[PDB]
């Protein structure tokens, strides 16, 4: 990879993408996968378990390469880009959020290519709803995260993991079930941050969630079944269709 | 990956490692690959073309995972470590050294997790022998690298690529033919930096070279043939053996 463009729109395109994990070569996780993630819009990726949603997120971070087809970022293949440049443009928060044993300010800074001020760290923690519980500590942001493995709450962990990606100011934000542990209060904080903010109105967001309520408000929804796009479009468009998306939502609480 | 130990010795172990590129599943590039990279020692990896030397370097950066066996860093599997933590501990320079279109000081800083001073940037460039030609520019270190693709010399590119990894201060330095373009003058600069320096006397170095002259002075030599360790040991030990290493060196200029 050589590409490090100073201006990235954030357009993501999957073109006939097929993938199988290198340890399971012929078990097609993805097959003929085609969609487009538009910059400034939040696209929700939903579907049944084992469909390939997290696999899609892995391919977007160039953790794996597609066996067939192309994963395109701003027109060029993802492999053409510099690895560390991708880290500066693409950030992903997950329901697989592993802290360290270091201070909270070190956990938030993470792989940042600079030294962030306290005003900067407090800001992203406030937007992620992690500032309050951190400020309650005697050592504050210098408090080393517990090596206990459960020294912290579920949502309080995700709040730290969220702020970690916010401070990166990525062009592409991938949320892999990183909203499940958050309460509706902190949920709205994220939603308003992604929807009702001028900062995140220029960036593309991939919201992977099992919570159809969150996908309901998304600008675009990708329904994934058997490793392929079963349906596509907004909530209303998918609703009147009365197919995969609708049937899945049909069985819910009104 | 969760591991981010504040103290890393740098011990690298390959244990019965077998690998095949995910696009070519049953073409065994590596098979029963076992060796140990000792901290504070420079280990040279040599062998015929297509043996798997660069593949080994790829596995060490966790770019790929072994289909069989284990790649161990300081006792724990490489996948157990945090991805961005690995970037802070493991740095690799290659004969595949792609610059950008940004300033020389930005190319050297690269993926650094902080903001480096000019004293710091000049130091690594001086040690890599890149300070002189950069200082000759009117804009100095702020000179944007040419988008021409050949605006710079071969060795002058490698000198910049070398300093990029030096400033990272990695526990594991991987040199994938990153010495071929350097003259014997700049060669000695690297050699003295790796051998005759207190800074690099505590770190492990993997020197991948086709230049047997460089491997001759290494603390340890790994001969790779058909994806496996044919022979092992220092220069003299491999010499008296009179096998793979010796025979390859037997045909040379005395
Ligand atoms: N590391 C891996 N190695 C091999 N196979 C895997 C790996 N990770 C996932 N798979 C397989 O790939 C399929 C897709 O998994 P993926 O995690 O993308 O599904 P998902 O849509 O995230 O599921 P859920 O909706 O339950 O989170 C799964 O059936 C799983 O068995
Ligand atoms: N990206 C790739 N995809 C598929 N196969 C590959 C890839 N890279 C290398 N190979 C194959 O793996 C084998 C090992 O390649 P590798 O680059 O490790 O050899 P090497 O020891 O670096 O060779 P040389 O000494 O000529 O540099 C080669 O025969 C090559 O055909
Ligand atoms: Mg999953
Ligand atoms: Mg090679
Ligand atoms: Ni990386």
Author numbering:
A (entry chain A), B (entry chain A): 469 to 722
From the paper:
Life depends on transport systems that shuttle ions and molecules across cell membranes. Interestingly, the two composite ATP-binding sites are functionally non-equivalent. Membrane transport via alternating access can occur either uni- or bidirectionally.
yielding two copies of the D-loop mutation in the homodimeric state. polarization-based competition assay showed that the affinities for ATP and ADP of isolated wt and D-loop (D651A) mutant rat TAP1-NBD are similar. the crystal structure of Walker B/D-loop double mutant rat TAP1-NBD. form the canonical NBD sandwich interface. asymmetric unit, reveals two significant differences. re-organization, the C-terminal regions slide with respect to each other. key interactions for the D-loop aspartate. γ-phosphate, backbone of A649 and A651, and N654 side chain. overall D-loop and Walker A positions are essentially unaffected. flexibility of the D-loop destabilize the NBD dimer and precludes ATP hydrolysis.
